[PDB]
Each structure stands twice: as C-alpha cells, then as structure tokens.
Amino acid sequence: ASLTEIEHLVQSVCKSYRETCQLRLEDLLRQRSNIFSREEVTGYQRKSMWEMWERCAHHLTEAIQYVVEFAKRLSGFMELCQNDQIVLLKAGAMEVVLVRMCRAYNADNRTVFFEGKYGGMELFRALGCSELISSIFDFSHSLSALHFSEDEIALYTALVLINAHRPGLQEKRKVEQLQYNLELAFHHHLCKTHRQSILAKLPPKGKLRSLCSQHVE
Numbered sequence: 001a002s003l004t005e006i007e008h009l010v011q012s013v014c015k016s017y018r019e020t021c022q023l024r025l026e027d028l029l030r031q032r033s034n035i036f037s038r039e040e041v042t043g044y045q046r047k048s049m050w051e052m053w054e055r056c057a058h059h060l061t062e063a064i065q066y067v068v069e070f071a072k073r074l075s076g077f078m079e080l081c082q083n084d085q086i087v088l089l090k091a092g093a094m095e096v097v098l099v100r101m102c103r104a105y106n107a108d109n110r111t112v113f114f115e116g117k118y119g120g121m122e123l124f125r126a127l128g129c130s131e132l133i134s135s136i137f138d139f140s141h142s143l144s145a146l147h148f149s150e151d152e153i154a155l156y157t158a159l160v161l162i163n164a165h166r167p168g169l170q171e172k173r174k175v176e177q178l179q180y181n182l183e184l185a186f187h188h189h190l191c192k193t194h195r196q197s198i199l200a201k202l203p204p205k206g207k208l209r210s211l212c213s214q215h216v217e
C-alpha cells in the first residue's frame with residue numbers, strides 16, 4: 001500500500017463520513033445557544049417512559065441507519081461476505097453512534113442535542129435509568145475534552161467497525177487486511193495533522209463495549 005493509496009483511503013473514509021453524518025457540525029455548534037426552557041424540560045419529565053423510549057428508540061434507530069450507510073461506503077466493506085458485514089455492524093454500530101454523539105454534546109453546560117434543542121440529562125428522567133444516562137454523558141464529556149475533529153471521528157469510527165477480533169467472523173483475514181489499512185490511514189493522518197497526542201487518550205476498545213452491555217440490558 002503506497003502513500004498515494006493511503007491518502008486516497010483517508011480522503012475516502014472522510015468523504016463517506018461527511019455524507020453519512022446526519023447532523024452537520026456547523027448546525028450543532030450554532031444550535032448550542034438554543035437550550036430547552038425549564039417549562040420544556042418539565043414537559044419531557046412528565047411524559048411516560050413508554051413515550052420517551054419511543055422517541056429515543058426512533059432517533060437512535062435512525063442514527064444506526066446512518067452508521068450502516070457509512071459502513072457500506074467504506075472501501076472493502078461491501079466486498080466482505082454477508083455474514084461478516086452483519087457481525088461487524090451488530091457488534092460496532094451502537095459504539096459508533098455513541099462516539100458520534102460527542103459532536104452533539106456541549107461540555108460548558110453539560111447538554112446534548114435532542115429534538116431541536118440542547119438539554120441536560122434531567123431531560124431523560126422518565127426513562128428511569130440515571131446511571132446509564134450519566135455514563136453516556138461522562139463518556140461524551142471525556143471525548144469532548146479531546147476536541148475530536150470531523151476527520152478523526154471518521155477514521156476512528158471506521159476502526160470501531162472494522163475489527164477482526166469480533167467473534168463469529170468467517171473471512172477473519174480479509175477483515176484484518178481492511179483493519180490494517182484503516183489503521184495506517186488513521187496514523188498517517190494524525191502524523192500529517194500533528195494530532196498523535198490523542199492516541200493515548202482515546203477510550204480503550206473494551207470500554208466502548210462495556211457501555212453497550214448495559215444498553216442491551
């Protein structure tokens with residue numbers, strides 16, 4: 001794999017991300033000042049857990065679909081066998097959503113984008129799982145401190161998906177090749193942008209999978 005192929009891969013992954021990100025960074029930052037009022041927060045708190053689940057499950061399910069589309073546009077992903085495509089998405093898609101979420105999170109006031117405005121974690125009180133929700137907020141908070149660029153997110157989330165250690169894979173070696181090239185791309189790009197320093201601050205790969213255990217519970 002030459003320098004030309006590696007930079008092509010970087011640009012390609014970043015393009016796919018751009019086309020499948022759902023919420024434009026520009027929009028999210030501008031909307032940071034648009035914050036749910038205390039009356040609105042109360043309105044969300046009064047809703048049933050069933051309604052809040054319906055709303056959240058709809059928005060996240062949609063977010064999952066954008067991640068599937070991202071995967072489809074990654075060089076080599078569609079060339080993998082049926083079984084491996086599904087195994088990877090099943091294991092990684094929700095982890096990618098979680099990472100993508102840090103973009104929609106404002107660390108100055110500890111709020112997240114939801115249904116047109118920014119609200120804190122108390123917005124989700126009717127769900128009755130303050131632990132899971134605080135941990136999601138903590139995770140987005142610790143990722144926000146890194147100032148993840150759009151392209152770092154693209155490359156990093158490509159690696160969250162293209163993991164050759166997912167159990168159930170048939171063509172393990174073809175997934176390794178793809179992972180290897182994406183790692184070269186990620187590392188090359190951190191080099192060129194002087195952002196090597198973030199490597200040692202990214203959350204461990206089993207730490208993403210430990211928040212999705214209790215998600216599925």
Ligand SMILES: COc1ccc2c(n1)CCN(C(=O)CCCC(=O)O)[C@H]2C(=O)Nc1cc(F)c2c(c1)CCC2(C)C
Nearest residue numbers: 056059060063097100101104112113114115116124136
């Ligand atoms: C992957 O990154 C993100 C981040 C936020 C949103 C999305 N993606 C999907 C679009 N969206 C909307 O609210 C779109 C509604 C458009 C409409 O009005 O119909 C957002 C949302 O879903 N935010 C959001 C959704 C959540 F389910 C949660 C949080 C937050 C925290 C806690 C919890 C995990 C419960």
